């Protein structure tokens, strides 16, 4: 869905 890196920043 979002992606973990995206959630990271």
């Amino acid at each position, epitope marked *: *869905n979002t992606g*973990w*890196l995206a959630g990271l920043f």
Partner: antibody
Amino acid sequence: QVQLRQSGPELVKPGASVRISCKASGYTFTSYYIHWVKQRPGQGLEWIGWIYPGNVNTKYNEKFKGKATLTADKSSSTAYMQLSSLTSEDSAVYFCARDDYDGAWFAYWGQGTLVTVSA
Amino acid sequence: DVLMTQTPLSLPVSLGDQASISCRSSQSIVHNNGNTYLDWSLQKPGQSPKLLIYKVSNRFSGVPDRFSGSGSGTDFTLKISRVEAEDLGVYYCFQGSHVPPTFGGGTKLEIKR
């Protein structure tokens, strides 16, 4: 097993645009990021930007904004990069790299594509 | 903008030696999440980089146990217990806990004679 296959060497005129393909095999294409890395012979490694096919999301390097344009096709599992106004200084090898979830930005690397800009 | 310097630029070494490569960051690269996203890669001439260590200490799939990473904050070290010829190439340190990620300049393993 994980496979990233890239377009093949391009010899382009300055100003003209270029498109590099990156075909993914051995994993759910829509579950991972696809990054792009520039390697100019004298400068080391440089992040261009990412794409996430899951929600078509893109994030770009400031340096590369409006220089690189990242798309992807879901049905062919093929990621593309288009670069626009080609400068002599866009002569580099360009890699596509996929991540490991909750692990690292770049886990599996493509073989690379050599772009040479000259008139 | 986060900055990564690898302190030995060239590392002359004999086959089957102790090897230490340092990597320093311009600022603390421990993410507000908690993790320290730092990677060691090895690039051989004519090839793509290959991930070795990730998240400071973790060994990637299929990486021999001669390689290891340590350190926290800004000071980070890669260690090869026994250098194995296939080990030779350019080692890069990498940061991925700040907005644009940044590589080190790279350390080259070279044969000492």
